[PDB]
């Protein structure tokens, strides 16, 4: 009965999707699929973050328009996410007319409400190219150790940090020209005006405890005003009444959440839902799934901007940690910086969705993909616990009983144990305690296989006159599989489709209360095959 709008952060248009992105989009997709299974109205929304100086310059280097480049990367991104079955209701772009008009609207409201301040800044400027230089497009000699060819605000030899204006013999990365200091008027959002409002939200208890603690450090340091403008040349939206000025991506990127939802509503011919979700009086819920590096922005700048432009604020932020591989940050030289597209040449989507889900929780903790453990855990849990309950029992049903399951449960007490667990498992999916849910499901899977072991169908099958016993045992195993695959349906969309085809039934959350009795099932080939370390070695080699 709830109306829920769920987002992931917008992937930057100038890089490929990797396993880091996939942790976030899989976490949200599992939660979204569970919310849909419980009958809520869910809108799962994302977009490509497509503006800015790095994109402008990359397109120039490639000799194509930025529009052509971001269109190609947006197609690549959506192809990867579709390969992982991320079930967005809309995937849009920050470079869109919807985002242009909402960025202009929010800015004009911030301005008339007094939250925009004009300030003159000084910044390095490339007079040959004719553009201001972001720090990482300035290179020079480290002032401390005199190492040449250092970029930006830090030296990769001695580790010093400094303003790029302290570099010796500085050079523009764009043109090679010596940069010079130049003044420019910039427009700043007066975030500090919202400190009392933001402090109340922090102590309200909605946010994760680790997030609220970090916010207290940021209030202690003191909130600053934030630049929301950039000088031409730029790839972005021009600021109205301010020729030669553009909105910086800090302003237009989160508005992409709104523009993507407005686009979805407009395509649907829906003229009411946008205001229903975004007006201050909304009874809809708004959730952002984000990583650690986005917390300051989404917990302070974003709700402040919404407040100052008369829109509702997020209901909650759901923050996850970083991905590591074999215990360490992803490493190109070791082949553990793994792209989403590369992953799918070697493994299916369900394997990674399962592994991540088994590790995730409601806390902010880094999530380690140990590749040896990945092989072991997929084989142990998917092939040998859950899929085993179908594969060990379906052959007898199809071959000796014409595909027909028994007319009554062999062990109704055991079946109730499985259906009784729905409340705790569903609450674990609801609360983002994914690892708790998977632990609960796998303990049930152990119990189901112990039941089959105790009944010993490989013995019953060879014994004269025990046909009814065999059909009863195997039908019981299959009904236990029906329940477990319902609990796993948010996690394993493709295996679930194969399970539904075998069972001749859609799996619904409430449907587990009616076991399949006197019911025809279909033959199947292989629901899920083993993986091995040779495939892990191939993936690592391919990613070097
Ligand atoms: Zn140095």
From Swiss-Prot:
Which compartments is it annotated to reside in?
A: Cytoplasm
Q: Cellular component per GO?
A: cytosol; membrane
Summarize where ATP binds, as residue positions: 332
> What are the entry keywords?
Aminoacyl-tRNA synthetase, ATP-binding, Cytoplasm, Ligase, Metal-binding, Nucleotide-binding, Protein biosynthesis, RNA-binding, tRNA-binding, Zinc
The catalytic activity, as recorded, is: tRNA(Met) + L-methionine + ATP = L-methionyl-tRNA(Met) + AMP + diphosphate
| Note accompanying the cofactor annotation | Binds 1 zinc ion per subunit.
| Motif 'KMSKS' region, residue range(s) on this chain | 329-333
Q: Which GO terms describe its molecular function?
A: ATP binding; methionine-tRNA ligase activity; protein homodimerization activity; tRNA binding; zinc ion binding
- Single Gene Ontology BP annotation: methionyl-tRNA aminoacylation
Complex and partners: Homodimer.
Write out the similarity annotation: Belongs to the class-I aminoacyl-tRNA synthetase family. MetG type 1 subfamily.
Recorded protein name is: Methionine--tRNA ligase
Tell me which species this is from: Escherichia coli (strain K12)
Relative to the complete UniProt sequence, the shown stretch is: 5 to 548 of 677
């Amino acid at each position: 009965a709830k109306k829920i709008l769920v987002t992931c952060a917008c992937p930057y248009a100038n890089g490929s999707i990797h396993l880091g992105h996939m942790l976030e989009h899989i976490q949200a997709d599992v939660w979204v699929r569970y919310q849909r299974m419980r009958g809520h109205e869910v809108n799962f929304i994302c977009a490509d973050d497509a503006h800015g100086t790095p994109i402008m310059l990359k397109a120039q280097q490639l000799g194509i328009t930025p529009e052509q480049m971001i269109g190609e990367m947006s197609q690549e991104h959506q192809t990867d996410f579709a390969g992982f079955n991320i079930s967005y209701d809309n995937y849009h772009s920050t470079h869109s007319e919807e985002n242009r008009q909402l960025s202009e609207l929010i800015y004009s409201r911030l301005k008339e409400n007094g939250f925009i301040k004009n300030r003159t800044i000084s910044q390095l400027y490339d007079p040959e190219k004719g553009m201001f230089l972001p720090d990482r497009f300035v290179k020079g000699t480290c002032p401390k150790c005199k190492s040449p060819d250092q970029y930006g605000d830090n030296c990769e030899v001695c580790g010093a940090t400094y303003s790029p204006t302290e570099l010796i013999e500085p050079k523009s990365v764009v043109s090679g020209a010596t940069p010079v200091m130049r003044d420019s008027e910039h427009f700043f959002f007066d975030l500090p005006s919202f400190s009392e409002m933001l402090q109340a939200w922090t102590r309200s208890g909605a946010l994760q405890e680790q997030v609220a603690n970090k916010m207290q450090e940021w209030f202690e340091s003191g909130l600053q005003q934030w630049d929301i403008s950039r000088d031409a040349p730029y790839f972005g939206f021009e600021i109205p009444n301010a020729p030669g000025k553009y909105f910086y991506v800090w302003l237009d990127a989160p508005i992409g959440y709104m523009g993507s939802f407005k686009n979805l509503c407009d395509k649907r011919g829906d003229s009411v839902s946008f205001d229903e979700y975004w007006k201050k009086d909304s009874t809809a819920e708004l959730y952002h799934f984000i990583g650690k590096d986005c917390v300051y922005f989404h917990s302070l700048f974003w709700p402040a901007m919404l407040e100052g432009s008369n829109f509702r604020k997020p209901s909650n932020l759901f923050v996850h940690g970083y991905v590591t591989v074999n215990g360490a940050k992803m490493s190109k030289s070791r082949g553990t910086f793994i792209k989403a597209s590369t992953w799918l040449n070697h493994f299916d989507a369900d394997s990674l969705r399962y592994y991540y889900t088994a590790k995730l929780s409601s806390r902010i903790d880094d999530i380690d993909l140990n590749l040896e453990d990945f092989v072991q855990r997929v084989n142990a849990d998917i092939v040998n616990k859950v899929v085993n309950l179908a594969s060990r029992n379906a052959g007898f049903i199809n071959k000796r009983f014409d595909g027909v399951l028994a007319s009554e449960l062999a062990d109704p007490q055991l079946y109730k144990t499985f259906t009784d667990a729905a409340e705790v498992i569903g609450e674990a999916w609801e609360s983002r305690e994914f690892g708790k849910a998977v632990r609960e499901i796998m303990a049930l899977a152990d119990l189901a296989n112990r039941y089959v072991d105790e009944q010993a169908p490989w013995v019953v099958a060879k014994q004269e006159g025990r046909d009814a016993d065999l059909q009863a045992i195997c039908s019981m195993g299959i009904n236990l599989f029906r329940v477990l695959m319902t609990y796993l349906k948010p996690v394993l969309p493709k295996l679930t489709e194969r399970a539904e085809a075998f069972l001749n039934t859609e799996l619904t959350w409430d449907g587990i209360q009616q076991p399949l009795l006197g019911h025809k099932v279909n033959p199947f080939k292989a629901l899920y095959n083993r993986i091995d370390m040779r495939q892990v070695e191939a993936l690592v080699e391919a990613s070097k």
